[PDB]
């Protein structure tokens, strides 16, 4: 039971289903089937992914479950409830990225102030 | 690992206007997942009952079935010259979806 790893970038969400290897993987959403040919070409599919390009705020949010070919939708061993916010070019500033940005900028500021001190003392 | 799905009766003797049933026993519990296909003498087959409870689109209403667990059956009455066929069942739980030997009616 590997958890469904999710990679959200910008306004697209890529729902990966790490279990059910090798076989075809389908998808289901609010007990309704997506991941194939339908009216909207935004919600794609792949061998492992369900790429919802132009992901809506609530029109595409619900219970997202993968099941292999042959297995029933309720025969799947796992569920996921997805409700996420999207933007045009938002990035999640978690504690690691914020700390990295702060330490990079403080090292940049220290190096620039040391260099400015050096050439100001030199002239 | 495939379900060895077999029918008890392979050749059934009946007559016109008779109501007779067709038995099909599964090797495992397949949670109301069967179908009931009929085979015409020329080889043209079609679906009559799916999910064992609901009827196919465009089927005559005289075809019906019931059962759950491992014992499933087809209920058919008023056999005609159009209804002489061989009747099949299939499982839906585990790949591959295995058929049976089929029960052929006799006039």
């Amino acid at each position, epitope marked *: 039971q590997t958890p469904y790893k999710v990679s959200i970038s910008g306004t697209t969400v890529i729902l990966t289903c790490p279990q059910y290897p090798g*076989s*075809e993987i*389908l998808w*289901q959403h609010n007990d309704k*089937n997506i991941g*194939g*040919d339908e009216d909207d070409k935004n919600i794609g*599919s792949d*061998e492992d992914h369900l790429s919802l390009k132009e992901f809506s705020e609530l029109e595409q949010s619900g219970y997202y479950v993968c*099941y292999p*070919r*042959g*297995s*029933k*939708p309720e*025969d799947a061993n796992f569920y996921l409830y997805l409700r996420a916010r999207v933007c045009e070019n938002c990035m999640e500033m978690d504690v690691m990225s914020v700390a990295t940005i702060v330490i990079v900028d403080i090292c940049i500021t220290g190096g620039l102030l040391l260099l400015v001190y050096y050439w100001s003392k030199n002239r | *690992m*495939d379900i060895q799905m077999t029918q008890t009766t392979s050749s059934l003797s009946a007559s016109l206007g008779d109501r007779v049933t067709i038995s099909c026993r599964a090797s495992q519990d397949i949670r109301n*997942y069967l*179908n009931w*296909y009929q085979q015409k003498p020329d*080889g*043209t*087959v*079609k*679906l009559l009952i*799916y*999910y064992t409870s609901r009827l*196919h689109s465009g089927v005559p209403s005289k075809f019906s079935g019931s059962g759950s667990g491992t014992d499933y059956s087809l209920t058919i009455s008023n056999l005609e010259q159009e209804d002489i066929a*061989t009747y*099949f069942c*299939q499982q*839906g739980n585990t*790949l*591959p*979806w*295995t*058929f*049976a*030997g*089929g029960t052929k009616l006799e006039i």
Partner: nanobody, 120 residues
Framework: EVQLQQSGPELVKPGASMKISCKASGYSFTGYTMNWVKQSHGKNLEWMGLINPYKGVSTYNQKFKDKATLTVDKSSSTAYMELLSLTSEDSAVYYC???????????????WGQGTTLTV
């Protein structure tokens, strides 16, 4: 209406490779799964596998994983089977059967083809 026409019966010699088509008409072909079913000896139906027309990913029977190969030309709305290493045991009818795309409705074969009497 919806109906599937297949290739004619071909007297294919054993050891060669056969190709049987089945057209799909009256419905959107890329949105319904095509299941390929062999009727051995005229009595016992055997399910060999399904090929998804859209993705192209095909799941086979465990017995017929190596003895069959399914391809789809989506432009001409066709479903193909490249039968390989034919034997006199393969002298049987080979239907192609439409089920639904998704797992709630892919287990019932709605409509069936005519049948290629692939005589070996």
């Amino acid at each position: 209406e919806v109906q599937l026409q297949q290739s004619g019966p071909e007297l294919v010699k054993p050891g060669a490779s056969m190709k049987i088509s089945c057209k799909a008409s009256g419905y959107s072909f890329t949105g319904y799964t095509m299941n390929w079913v062999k009727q051995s000896h005229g009595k016992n139906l055997e399910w060999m596998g399904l090929i998804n027309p859209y993705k192209g990913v095909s799941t086979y029977n465990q017995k017929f994983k190596d003895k069959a190969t399914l391809t789809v030309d989506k432009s001409s709305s066709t479903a193909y089977m490249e039968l390989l290493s034919l034997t006199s045991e393969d002298s049987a009818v080979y239907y192609c059967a439409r089920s639904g795309y998704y797992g709630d409705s892919d287990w019932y074969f709605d409509v069936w083809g005519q049948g290629t009497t692939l005589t070996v």
